Design a protein around this ligand. Structure first.
Ligand SMILES: [Ca+2]
Ligand SMILES: [Cl-]
Ligand SMILES: [Cl-]
Lengths: 188, 149, 156, 156, 149, 190, 188, 190
């Protein structure tokens, strides 16, 4: 049904947006050993890492994305990857693309005569999914530079990517159905 | 102490997760570029290609499994997706086979205890497929009984 | 004493005999399940012709082709048939990679009880191939003779 | 100093850059020759439709599929086209085997200037795949926009 | 001092000659079992299958090259031939790849001097195919000119 | 040809059930060195191991599926595998499914009107074969985890799996034929 | 033309039979170092090996297919392979099959009303080819038990196999054409 | 669209021929250490090697294709490869075939009735590309048989091969179009 499809697509869009917004704004991206001052269990996110045990429990410290190493013989690829991870450009791009898809799906309901808004929403949703993929790869690969595990914030982003792709599929299906109905009306 | 799923050892968990993510993304993009354009539909309305979302996922799985398929993309964007997926698949599967050959040579015949996991996966897949087939048959039978009344 | 050269059927060495029997059983079961999920439903039948061509013989041929990494003229189209095919594809990938990892090394190991492969290490597969050609010829000739006798009896 | 991790495009390491450029040239030449031997003869043409579907784009697709060991929906049927196909198949077998012999070892070599593969060694292929998906999306959107503008001008 | 054809090193030339012999025999047996029976012809008369000698050779070559085909045998004897050829092909190609990895692991990138032989074979095949196509075109043109007179 | 198909299906079903029951009951699964007292040639099945030859010939002892001591509990996967082997749940499940397939065959031969019973019998036979495959894999894996050989009970189980799959194929063919005949009769009547 | 095809088939059958008869009856199967008495260049065949240089040039000695070795721990597979090589069962079987195929072709020429004789000839020819394959494999594999090369007898047998398979193909084609002509006559 | 196709084909043919001739003539094929006197940065093409920088900057010397001494004529394959490289037969053959393709294009543009000229031009272009591939492979193999780099003459040859293949495709398309138009006119007239 058109109403069922619209409800499912809107619900998925909102759920994905909320999950990704929580993922960006939370500090449970990774569990690893470290120091929250300036080596106990630490939970890390995108911008800050905090300890979970010991005397320094509950203290959060900002992530140093540019460590003061010897720095000799440094390829620009590592600096570019570190800058991409520090700026979190792809998670933020995914957030903005999801929000723009949500506005497009909202606009189509108030602009039912216009059909390319739904296609734009689908494009935005699948682009947000691809942005999620690139951001996840960037974050994991930057983590490379001995036991670690990811919290629910990382898996929140994973489910956000999956839901965004599913919602994009549903939006493109709605576009197909609208154009097919228009063609059938024109034929008769 | 290798487990029942020791055949997944050559690649890391992150690689497997990103493989699933990439498979989903490639299939969705294939469906999008195959079916979004109204000019690719002609006259119900029948598309110029058999690349729905289900068929796109089947094509992507066949490409990654080195097994082939009965359909192939014909448009420029669909073929771009297919070619980039072929390149990714070749690299990933070749890397898996090379690292597996390295892992198995750390001449002793392989034992069943090393592939029991893949056997279990095969039987679980067979059971799941049978369950879906019977559920679909029951749904169709119930619909036919309701329509006959 | 003398070093023992690999046997005529040394191509089965890389995998244990238990794995070989389990592979045969898995192949039979996969073919049966594929045929079942393809043909059992009367809603897949149209005096009547099935929507797909996945009979028992065709299912066995498809499973053999998938295991030999060759492929055939048919492909499952239903959701359940595709689940069967995909899981069989994953199984084939894992098993074939494990088997072909060190086949050449397994074909030349000398036991007391880099070099190019010689024909003595592949004489077994050559013998099996020629035997298969002979068996196919015999089956075809038997089929022709039976058909000719049946046609002669029909016309007489 | 610090050990250098393999680059983002370390998947090209197993073969030299000369081999890569020669592979690209061989692929282009094989596609052109396949198209030529398939379509040049007017006796293969029937307003008129060719006997085969081996146009330049389809020939390029066939050659790419043969090199990626995938296969497509078409196969050469003439004697000349089959010679091209078979020689390209032999070339693909040799080259792909040589490339995939030690890909995993080439993806993890550390240089001063067994372990599982990590995502850092395959981030390059993942980046290329996502870029290809984006490029395909852009091309499809451009095609739709151009077609819509053309249809609007036709109706206006 | 490996030659231009060092990619044939993993197998002995006796194996290669027997491979050619086996390929010829399998193709001939495929043609025989596909086309000998008059009961497989129905009504010129059109066969039930597309397995002539030329098509049989093409199918066998595709099977050995890990490339697939557009046709597959359907009869019992033809499928027996195809299955035994598939088994032989899998064994031989897997052995070649394993021994090739061993030969190349006696991490240095491969040089073009190791594959110049396969490149030469490819270009020679392309030239031969062009020659056959042009000769066929000339024959057809001459026949058409003679018929038009 | 329906009657001969029914007879072949019943004979194969009974043969598979009998072979599986005999294989499960009998202890001639594996020949290996061992002890029957709570190193000589012994035979072992699924429940008990008995010795051949020697002074303790013919003495049987129950298999201890948790050897060694100290009750090493570090990984739950090994405990799960050992429990699955000890219960012998999969060979017995195969036997049960074969029995339900035979019961379905008999009920179909009695009712002769409800066609879904044939489909249920075929499904039961296929599932019994799959359970037999799983049980064989579990048994061999637990055995791996001194030359050894397999007795005639193991091959009885293998033959049971093969015959069960054959009977499942035959039953599915029978169901398809019944639906085809029903459709033809419906077309002829209307 | 049918006459041209039949002439080519008969010529190929005769040429293959002559080539195999020369191959079995000659002593140039293999070139290897050895002694022709009871280590100079020696040319070997199926039954005798002779020298080509030195004081013992021109002297032929029988091939010992059962050498007097220690014989301990000898599997029956090696003995069976040695017996097959010594008897040369497959080259002789190929010769007999080729001769029987030629006789079938001649009979079909003298029994034109009968059509299964041509099919029998084709079966005989392809069986002779397969026999050639097995025979050369047996001979090479038995040669395993450091420079050697094959003379023109081995390659004569190889060409005999190729020609036998080609002639079998031609005979089966003739069978197909005869049955097609009969069916066309019956239809009209 | 026939005229624009003809113009593109002629422009591409001339570009490929010019690039191949410049690449063959010029000596900026490879940058490597060497000497120009009968170790510094030098450049080498197909005939001569010249040095860059230093006191002997700009001095060119002819390449000796048979280095070392003792005239080691052990294997004929190496001698054949060295002779093939020294003759430079394949790049020059590519140049000749490109010239014949251009001549065929020019002749077809004049006759306008013989359609086999277009097919001959396409065949010549394809063969020229193949000869260029063979020459590149021979050159690189002989070079392999100290970091090095390829100059702009090598890439000129590569671009020449690519453009030659493109022009061959265009010429085959033109031949196909001419035959299609002829067939359509024949069908319309009769
Ligand atoms: Ca390998
Ligand atoms: Cl027991
Ligand atoms: Cl120069």
């Amino acid at each position: 049904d058109r109403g069922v499809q619209m409800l499912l697509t809107t619900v998925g869009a909102f759920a994905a947006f909320s999950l990704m917004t929580i993922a960006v704004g939370t500090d449970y991206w990774l569990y690893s050993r470290g120091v929250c001052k300036t080596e106990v269990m630490t939970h890390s996110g995108l911008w800050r890492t905090c300890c979970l045990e010991g005397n320094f429990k509950g203290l959060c410290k900002q992530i140093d994305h540019f460590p003061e190493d010897a720095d000799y013989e440094a390829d620009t690829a590592e600096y570019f990857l570190r800058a991409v991870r520090a700026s979190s450009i792809f998670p933020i791009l995914s957030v903005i693309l999801l929000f723009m898809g949500g506005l497009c799906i909202a606009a189509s309901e108030f602009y039912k005569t216009r059909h390319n808004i739904i296609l734009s929403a689908g494009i935005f949703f699948v682009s947000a999914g691809l942005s999620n993929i690139i951001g996840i790869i960037v974050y994991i690969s930057a983590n490379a530079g001995n036991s670690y595990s990811y919290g629910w914030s990382f898996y929140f982003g994973a489910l956000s990517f999956i839901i965004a792709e599913m919602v994009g599929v549903l939006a493109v299906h709605m576009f197909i159905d609208r154009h097919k109905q228009l063609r059938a009306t024109a034929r008769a | 102490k290798p487990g029942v799923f020791s055949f997944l050892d050559p690649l890391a968990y992150e690689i497997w997760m990103c493989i699933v993510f990439a498979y989903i993304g490639v299939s969705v993009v294939l469906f999008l570029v195959s079916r979004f354009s109204p000019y690719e539909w002609h006259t119900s309305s029948e598309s110029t290609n058999e690349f729905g979302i289900f068929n796109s996922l089947w094509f992507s799985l066949g490409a990654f499994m080195q097994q082939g398929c009965d359909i192939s993309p014909r448009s420029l964007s669909g073929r771009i997706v297919g070619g980039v997926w072929w390149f990714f698949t070749l690299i990933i599967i070749s890397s898996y086979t090379a690292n597996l050959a390295a892992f198995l040579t750390v001449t002793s015949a392989l034992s069943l205890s090393n592939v029991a996991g893949v056997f279990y996966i095969l039987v679980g897949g067979l059971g799941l497929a049978m369950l879906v087939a019977l559920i679909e048959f029951c749904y169709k039978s119930r619909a036919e009984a309701k329509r006959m009344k």
